[PDB]
Design an enzyme around this catalytic site. Structure first.
Site, PDB file in Angstrom:
ATOM      1  N   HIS A  41      87.782  21.973  43.469  1.00 48.62           N
ATOM      2  CA  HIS A  41      86.931  22.790  42.610  1.00 48.62           C
ATOM      3  C   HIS A  41      87.704  23.739  41.719  1.00 48.62           C
ATOM      4  O   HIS A  41      87.129  24.483  40.930  1.00 48.62           O
ATOM      5  CB  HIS A  41      85.886  23.556  43.437  1.00 48.62           C
ATOM      6  CG  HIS A  41      86.434  24.687  44.252  1.00 48.62           C
ATOM      7  ND1 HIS A  41      87.037  25.791  43.687  1.00 48.62           N
ATOM      8  CD2 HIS A  41      86.384  24.928  45.583  1.00 48.62           C
ATOM      9  CE1 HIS A  41      87.330  26.665  44.634  1.00 48.62           C
ATOM     10  NE2 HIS A  41      86.943  26.166  45.793  1.00 48.62           N
ATOM     11  N   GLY A 143      90.004  34.526  45.595  1.00 49.29           N
ATOM     12  CA  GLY A 143      91.285  33.861  45.423  1.00 49.29           C
ATOM     13  C   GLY A 143      91.893  33.286  46.688  1.00 49.29           C
ATOM     14  O   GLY A 143      92.811  32.465  46.632  1.00 49.29           O
ATOM     15  N   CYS A 145      90.800  31.190  48.399  1.00 48.49           N
ATOM     16  CA  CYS A 145      90.572  29.752  48.308  1.00 48.49           C
ATOM     17  C   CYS A 145      91.932  29.051  48.220  1.00 48.49           C
ATOM     18  O   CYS A 145      92.759  29.379  47.364  1.00 48.49           O
ATOM     19  CB  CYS A 145      89.712  29.423  47.073  1.00 48.49           C
ATOM     20  SG  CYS A 145      87.944  29.949  47.121  1.00 48.49           S
TER      21      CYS A 145
END
Length: 301
Positions: A41, A143, A145
């Protein structure tokens, strides 16, 4: 003595963390040999806030658009790809720190250490457990992620879990290192939910033995009980039911602590039906369903 939240050292993994960027989205990446994994993503904008079409969102992108900042030096993304929900990248240089590794897809209840990062630079590390309904109660932010989960055996880092999303329920969802989400869920900022959650019965029982090897023995009681009988009280208390299989695993702490497992189940069965009211257990004042058998053996061996 002592006992607490204890994660593995992050040495080997710290050496595999990079930065990855795409427009206004930039998230942590795991750099093993010459490949750089990261959530797919990363190519989404507010496009996630709908029904982003990865196939299309992707094919409409090229290498030059990937800012892979491996710490302080920037590599050359020679290519990209897509393996399920993961975005496989092939770059010029292979990582000279890449430690012996495996990719494992843990099971609920299992535990692992997670190295939290922001722009390729790790910040902290803690423990987590794949909760029943397949979520993880971690501390990820704007972030994070891209952060990973793992376990060790010195020699070999077994990578399980990569952070992707945070459900509007505030919990965390991700995947193994093959781009596959644990439990249903989709990398969509849409629709999604977190079904009711159970408690990891084995973990609770393992923790109890732990709390025993280190003093605290008030919870232990004379009354005992059966496996088919205990499970009944477990349904009343969103507990996971007890198989004979779990009984076999506690076998070891059992033989060493001097407390038959079904016995340990009678104490908990009580703890649940009754309560505590003061008398805590290993610091906590609640059952710790976040330590697995093996986790308890590490700190007690």
């Amino acid at each position: 003595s002592g006992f607490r939240k204890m994660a593995f050292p992050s040495g080997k993994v710290e050496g595999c963390m990079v930065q990855v960027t795409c427009g206004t989205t930039t998230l942590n990446g795991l750099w093993l040999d010459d490949t750089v994994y990261c959530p797919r993503h990363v190519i989404c904008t507010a496009e996630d806030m709908l029904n982003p079409n990865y196939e299309d969102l992707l094919i409409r992108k090229s290498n030059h658009s990937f800012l892979v900042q491996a710490g302080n030096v920037q590599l050359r993304v020679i290519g990209h790809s897509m393996q399920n929900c993961l975005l496989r990248l092939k770059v010029d240089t292979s990582n000279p720190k890449t430690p012996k590794y495996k990719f494992v897809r843990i099971q609920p209840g299992q535990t692992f250490s997670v190295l939290a990062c922001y722009n390729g630079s790790p910040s902290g590390v803690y423990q987590c457990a794949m909760r029943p309904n397949h979520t993880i109660k971690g501390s990820f932010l704007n972030g994070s992620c891209g952060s990973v989960g793992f376990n060790i055996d010195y020699d070999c880092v077994s990578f399980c879990y990569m952070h992707h999303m945070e459900l509007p329920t505030g919990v965390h969802a991700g995947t193994d290192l093959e781009g596959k989400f644990y439990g249903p869920f989709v990398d969509r900022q849409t629709a999604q939910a977190a079904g009711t959650d159970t408690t990891i019965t084995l973990n609770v029982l393992a923790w109890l033995y732990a709390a025993v090897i280190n003093g605290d023995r008030w919870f232990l009681n004379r009354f005992t009980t059966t496996l088919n009988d205990f499970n009944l009280v477990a349904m009343k208390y969103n507990y996971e039911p007890l198989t004979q299989d779990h009984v076999d695993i506690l076998g070891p702490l059992s033989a060493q602590t001097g407390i038959a497992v079904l016995d340990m189940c009678a104490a908990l069965k009580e703890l649940l039906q009754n309560g505590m009211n003061g008398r805590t257990i290993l610091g906590s004042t609640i059952l710790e369903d976040e330590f697995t058998p093996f986790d308890v053996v590490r700190q007690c061996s």
